[PDB]
């Protein structure tokens, strides 16, 4: 039994080809995993609180309070794009391919090992290690999804990239049900804001505990475990951003006079006056038909209220945004109209020699141009008396109730009849692959997280924990402290994923931006003499296309 090992170790990228533009991108990967024995034992419910910060006046949310159930188990999981792909391999996908389709996913675990630590006292101490055959490892994997769900990166504690370096899973946890309400506050607020907790509604409680649900293959080690392949169900994603904004929807007006000399300050003429132009329009009184005012088949994007926190069971939380900041060059900070900004560390950047610790941060803009730029928006009466007098219209400079930061733009919305937008572009390699789809019946039209969504059910996760041991002592069903033999165990892990894509084709006269090395990043790709690594972010949606 022990005298064999059944596994293989693969990180490869192989391009198999078919007829007529359909190309299977088949990527594999693997990692080495080390796993501490969980120090706790029983399932554990905890409520976290920090209030001096919500106590002091102001501080809308610098934090809230949550309650979770911490299992001893731990989660090895896929669903990053740094687990399988390489910024070397990533190139040939995004330059040649206009679309993706998802197919199939599978995992297996092979050649487990279990070790042991015996800590001497009178010795220095030195740590003895004797490989233990008869100890055991637990593997619990469900394809039913019944037990509750998370992906992981809302943080990116996910498996480390590169396949020479080990990586660790993370302890597994999920939200419980409480109630909280929090009243506003600011610097000038007097009295008390009345911040209170609020127990738990007993009507609704979920303790979900996998040992009450899903089987568990147990392993001493010669043995392997393999999950069969569970397919996906999805819709494709476009790799090609849409530049045309509400200006480019239509046929442009006809110039009646064409300019002359080469070199430019040279401006053509619309050739008619503003009064006599001919065309369709929507407006209160038109002797005016402009490049601006005119009927367009529909809008693009939506103006959304930004930084508005609606209250609920958890009270304060942020209301997300589905668009990019494209067209707005003057508002940055981090992600002004919203540009999801990843913060990770020590594991996929902030080059791998970093003394102490400190997070890593980059604002990821959109490469899609849909203008939501709030500045330069206002409203008129229906009379259209031009030039307009200050008393008959609005500006972003006008308060609400006598305030300043608010313009009017913080309270607005449209979205309704004519709007549309493009599915959120995938990001890399801190992003996410697939996402489970909501349980209710109205099925939001997208997610500001994942590119792809299983419309039926997504494949599950892989849970693992060391098997317990006792020496001699015990009490039955006791939350007192039972002694233990400190151990740990390593197991290799493999993964496979299947893609389908189509080659794009030129039909333009122009070349198109690609990713490539230069001297801007000269070496962001090549290791540092201590072994340094980064894998800087890279923006992929590179391909402009027609829209309407």
């Amino acid at each position, epitope marked *: 039994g022990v005298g064999i090992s059944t596994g293989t170790f693969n990180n490869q990228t192989e391009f198999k080809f078919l007829e007529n533009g359909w190309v299977y991108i088949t990527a594999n990967s693997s990692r080495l995993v080390h796993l501490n024995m969980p120090e706790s034992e029983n399932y554990r*419910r905890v409520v976290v*609180n920090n*209030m*001096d910060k919500t*106590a002091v006046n102001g501080n809308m949310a610098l934090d809230d309070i949550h309650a979770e159930i911490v299992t001893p188990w731990s989660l090895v999981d896929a669903n990053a794009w740094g687990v399988w792909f390489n910024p070397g391999d990533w190139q040939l996908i995004v330059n040649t391919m206009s679309e993706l389709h998802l197919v199939s996913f599978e995992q297996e675990i092979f050649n487990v090992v279990l070790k042991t630590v015996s800590e001497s006292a009178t010795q220095p101490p030195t740590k003895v290690y004797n490989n233990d055959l008869t100890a055991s490892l637990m593997v619990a994997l469900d394809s039913n999804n019944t037990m509750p769900f998370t992906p992981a990166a809302m943080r990116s504690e996910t498996l480390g990239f590169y396949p020479w370096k080990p990586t660790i899973p993370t302890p597994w946890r999920y939200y419980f049900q409480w109630d909280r309400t929090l009243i506003p506050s600011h610097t000038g607020t007097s009295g*008390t804001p*009345t*911040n*209170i*907790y*609020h*127990g*738990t509604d*007993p009507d609704d409680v979920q303790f979900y505990t996998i040992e009450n649900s899903v089987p568990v293959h147990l392993l001493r080690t010669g043995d392997e475990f393999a999950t069969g392949t569970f397919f996906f169900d999805c819709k494709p994603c476009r790799l090609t951003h849409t530049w045309q904004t509400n200006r480019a929807l239509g046929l442009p007006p006809f110039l009646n006079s064409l300019p002359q000399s080469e070199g430019d300050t040279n401006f053509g003429d619309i050739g008619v006056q503003q009064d006599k132009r001919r065309g369709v329009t929507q407006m209160g009184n038109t002797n005016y038909i402009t490049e601006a005012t005119i009927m367009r088949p529909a809008e693009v994007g939506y103006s959304a209220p930004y930084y508005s926190f609606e209250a609920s069971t958890q009270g304060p939380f942020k209301t997300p945004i589905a668009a990019g900041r494209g067209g707005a060059q003057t508002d940055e900070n981090q992600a002004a109209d919203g540009n999801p900004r990843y913060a990770f560390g020590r594991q996929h950047g902030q080059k791998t020699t970093t003394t102490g610790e400190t997070p890593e941060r980059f604002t990821y803009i959109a490469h899609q141009d849909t203008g939501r730029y709030p500045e330069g928006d206002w409203i008129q009466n229906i009379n259209f008396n031009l030039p307009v007098t200050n008393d008959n219209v609005l500006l972003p400079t006008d308060p609400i109730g006598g305030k300043t930061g608010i313009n009017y733009t913080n309270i607005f919305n449209t979205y309704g009849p004519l709007t549309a937008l493009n599915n959120v572009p995938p990001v890399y390699p801190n992003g996410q692959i697939w996402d489970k789809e909501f349980d209710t019946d109205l099925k939001p039209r997208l997610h500001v997280n994942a590119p792809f969504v299983c419309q039926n059910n997504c494949p599950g996760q892989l849970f693992v924990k060391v098997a317990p041991n006792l020496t001699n002592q015990y009490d039955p069903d006791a939350s007192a402290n039972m002694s233990r033999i400190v151990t740990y165990s390593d197991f290799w892990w493999k993964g496979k994923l299947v893609f389908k894509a189509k080659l794009r084709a030129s039909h333009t006269w122009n070349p198109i931006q690609q990713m490539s090395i230069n001297v801007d990043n000269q070496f962001n790709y090549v290791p540092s003499n201590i072994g340094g690594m980064k894998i800087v972010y890279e923006k992929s949606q590179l391909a402009p296309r027609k829209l309407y």
Partner: antibody, heavy 115, light 106 residues
Framework: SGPGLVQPSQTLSLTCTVS????????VHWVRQPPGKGLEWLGV???????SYNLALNSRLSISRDTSKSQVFFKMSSLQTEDTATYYC????????????????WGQGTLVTVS | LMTQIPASMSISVGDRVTMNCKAS??????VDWYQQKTGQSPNLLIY???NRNTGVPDRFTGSGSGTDFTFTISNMQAEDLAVYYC?????????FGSGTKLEIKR
């Protein structure tokens, strides 16, 4: 509670009716000496609680009949006395965390329980 | 934790006095004071400093912040007497201080 020794049963009950805000969950049984002390302020049972010395457990249903229990035995050899048990009963804590805090009113003066 | 001193105060009716307190862990302003109002007792007066309410304002006044507090008495009558208490409110657990003992000078 008692009387009197060394650890007999029950005899703590008040007050019916309208015993306070039912927030899951509440106090106040007065608590304690009064010069002390005391009593780190009941939760709700499986597992929510609780008080600061073992075998001080409290339990009751906040629905009607609105009542209390036990309470309790517990370790009485210190000759301490709180014999009532009357309400309003501010914010417990657990709920709380204003921060904290404060305690308006009370009721039903001296009841003394023997050693 | 919390202690309550001075003591042995004998005053004429209506006169003022200072009552103070000292504590270790930084309490923000959680500081509170319980005042009989003899019956039904102790029947707190001022909430965390300062709220003069309960049951009608300007009987006493509290003020101050942080590790110290100074308790103050404007209107003294035969409707208040004897001895009083202070609390701190922080974490587990609660704790009480002990005692002042102010009776009308006779």
């Amino acid at each position: 509670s008692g009387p009197g020794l060394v650890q007999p049963s029950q005899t703590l009950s008040l007050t019916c009716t309208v015993s306070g805000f039912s927030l899951s969950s509440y106090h106040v049984h007065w608590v304690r000496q009064p010069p002390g002390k005391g009593l780190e302020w009941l939760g709700v049972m499986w597992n929510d609680g609780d008080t600061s010395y073992n075998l001080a457990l409290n339990s009751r249903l906040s629905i009607s009949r609105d009542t209390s229990k036990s309470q309790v035995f517990f370790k009485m050899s210190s000759l301490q006395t709180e014999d009532t048990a009357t309400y309003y009963c501010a914010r417990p804590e657990l709920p709380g965390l204003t921060y904290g805090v404060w305690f308006p009113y009370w009721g039903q003066g001296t009841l003394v329980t023997v050693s | 934790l919390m202690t309550q001193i001075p003591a042995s105060m004998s005053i004429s009716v209506g006169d003022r006095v200072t009552m103070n307190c000292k504590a270790s862990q930084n309490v923000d302003s959680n500081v509170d004071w319980y005042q009989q109002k003899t019956g039904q007792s102790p029947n707190l007066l001022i909430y965390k400093a300062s709220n003069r309410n309960t049951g009608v304002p300007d009987r006493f006044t509290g003020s101050g912040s942080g590790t110290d507090f100074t308790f103050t008495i404007s209107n003294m009558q035969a409707e208040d007497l004897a001895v009083y208490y202070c609390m701190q409110s922080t974490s587990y657990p609660l704790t009480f201080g002990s005692g002042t003992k102010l009776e009308i000078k006779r």
